[PDB]
Symmetry: C4
């Protein structure tokens, strides 16, 4: 039904907003102030967007997040691909629109995710993994219909999880936690240096999060039947 | 019924508070610290006011927001006009009372919305549009009775949306997102320079937000009948 | 019943905690950082305490707040007096315990509420009034059983209202918004300079808040009968 | 049942995350900025983890917290021991993994809890006590099934309680409030100087919190029967 294309649209616009506001708030340099401010910006961007379209598409706005739900057998392979496609175009569009209204000199590299001189790509990949792992873990747990009438706003919980990822990570890798968010700055600045970290960390972290939740913490046992039936629809 | 004049009163007092506390917290200069602090101040002012009178008038406290609900066919043309009238007088009053208790030298221009030297009015109008667009989008989505038992506090969601608007926007336009909030400082400092941006951006953004929500994301299909019936009451 | 002395105890301990953590976090000087940090500290102290004992005593932890509920005919004159008595002793105790574990040199004046050199006591009284007014207004609205299933945490709403009061007020009067919180530092440092502001502003603001809510925004019409019956119990 | 080993696992992973992100965000020095940022990091780490596994193990992720529930007769002596065991190994593991991905020079002492030169261990023990006391008090009150449909997110309430503990405490003792969180940095840096404070304060504070709640504020009267029956299972 049209109850599918609306979601794809939700994922496109939300991703454009997420990157537009996220990157926009990161322009400049610096420091606690800097980190604190950028951590809150991305976090509140997500909390806002999750309230805005979480009921419509589940507000993934993140390829690694969508990948998590795929292996978690909660969405079809067809939906996953489109979500990720919409997320990549949306992100690029947000970065594009951001570039068009931002004064040069302040533009910098459009907040491209970058490693710290003293951090190896190996350590950086492990950082991005842990960041995305606690992040996806919070998403799965709070989206789980099987629990709590005392959750409060799941939109904010997830947003603050993203903020926590930044408060810690920015010092190491600028905190990617999202392939699409990393990709947009890279494709427009023509700089794919160390970009592998920002696809690998999240995907693996997202993978370990889903697995850890569904197959150990609070098992959601699906029969091989449904798995394929879902991965198909 | 009197269940109409109470709301107008709600919109008047809330607007006076919103501008009084919002502007008051913006006095001085500066920087992350500055932005972070002012972003939170406006955001918590709104979250507070939305809890205070959201059940009474819907706590629009913003002309562009009210305009959004008009074209969204959720209020009558009569209510909209009064809301906006109450919002403009309330704002001016808040700025007035703020001026009366604030020491000169610190008064400055009473936190008048201003463009960054390197930002054209065109880019500034597009910024204000995006700010108000994600803002109204969050308002519509969270006010929508058709969704979530997991929303948490809608008052805070909207407040944090406003904070996000500031964390990004202040650097560009000081972040208006509200004609009344921009107007009060302008009418009292007799400075309407670039004021057009602060009416145009929000109104258009507010317009694109409502349209985007009601006519694409989660369509609320009203028959031409009701539209006029509502725009009339 | 004992369902009265538990509340008095709740108000005593909560007040000791409120002042202990509130003042403790204010030691030193400074600036956004300073204000932001102290605003959040008092705010989260209250949100925490309101969750801790709001169901037991309503968590007034504030004489001006209790006064608001008295004139609002929601508590007896007997309860009000005891609450305020417990709040004053609790506060002093918190400041006392704070003094005993804090290193001198850092102690300063134990975060005594103070006016800004350029702010007259008249302007300062009007500031404290507005601060306490939006504060009590938020308390009444969020405690009102007659509304919202979308309030979220009222504990946090009120806490953030207090934070907003500080983000704006600290620059003017250090932000009292609470006679007991102002009193404790004064009685122990033997400095009652301008102390009148910190009793007068809140009480009046608290008074205007209750009146504004119960007699105009969302009238809670009590017959003269009940008023006295309540003011008596 | 397996509805016991999942919880132990929950407590292990959550503790590893808590310390990994908590310590990681504390690396460096400094100041409001520093404190504010670290306070929020620990706070949001907990709020996140409480949402992630609070429904599975109650998300104690803290020996002093678990001890509180033991004397509160809410868990068996067998569960308590395992929880604390899982919490200690989890913490050490988190600090270990943190060390492996963090650049030296920035590693410092891995955010080891430390006293301020001007603070005696006696004053420091009293500080840690008060910090953990308001903390446990908030936990008990918000976990209490006997109250509120207006609590909002208990995960966030507790998290913000932890943040408040840091906003005040870091200046004194770096804010331990958690034996496991203090232990991990100590065992790996081979520095147990003043470590006694970080086990004694929390345990006593946690003890006074439970007692204060269950035996005075909102008594949860258990017959000697059940007490032992529970302490046994």
């Amino acid at each position: 039904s049209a109850s599918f294309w609306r979601a794809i649209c939700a994922e496109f616009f939300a991703s454009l907003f997420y990157v537009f506001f996220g990157l926009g708030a990161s322009l400049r340099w610096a420091g606690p102030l800097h980190v604190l401010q950028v951590a809150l910006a991305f976090g509140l961007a997500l909390a806002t967007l999750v309230q805005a379209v979480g009921h419509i598409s589940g507000a993934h706005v993140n390829p690694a997040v969508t990948f998590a739900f795929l292996v978690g057998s909660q969405m079809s392979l067809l939906r996953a691909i489109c979500y990720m496609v919409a997320q990549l175009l949306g992100a690029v569009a947000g970065a594009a629109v951001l570039y068009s209204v931002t004064p040069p000199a302040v533009r910098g590299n459009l907040a491209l995710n970058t490693l710290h001189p003293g951090v190896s790509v190996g350590q950086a990949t492990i950082v991005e993994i842990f960041l995305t792992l606690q992040f996806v873990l919070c998403i799965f747990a709070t989206y789980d219909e099987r629990r709590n009438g005392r959750l409060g706003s799941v939109a904010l919980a997830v947003g603050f999880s993203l903020t926590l990822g930044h408060l810690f990570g920015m010092y190491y890798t600028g905190a990617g936690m999202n392939p699409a968010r990393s990709f947009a700055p890279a494709i427009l600045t023509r700089n794919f240096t160390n970009h592998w970290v920002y696809w690998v960390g999240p995907v693996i972290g997202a993978g370990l999060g889903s697995l850890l939740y569904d197959f150990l913490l609070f098992p959601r046992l699906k029969s091989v039947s449904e798995r394929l039936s879902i991965l198909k629809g």
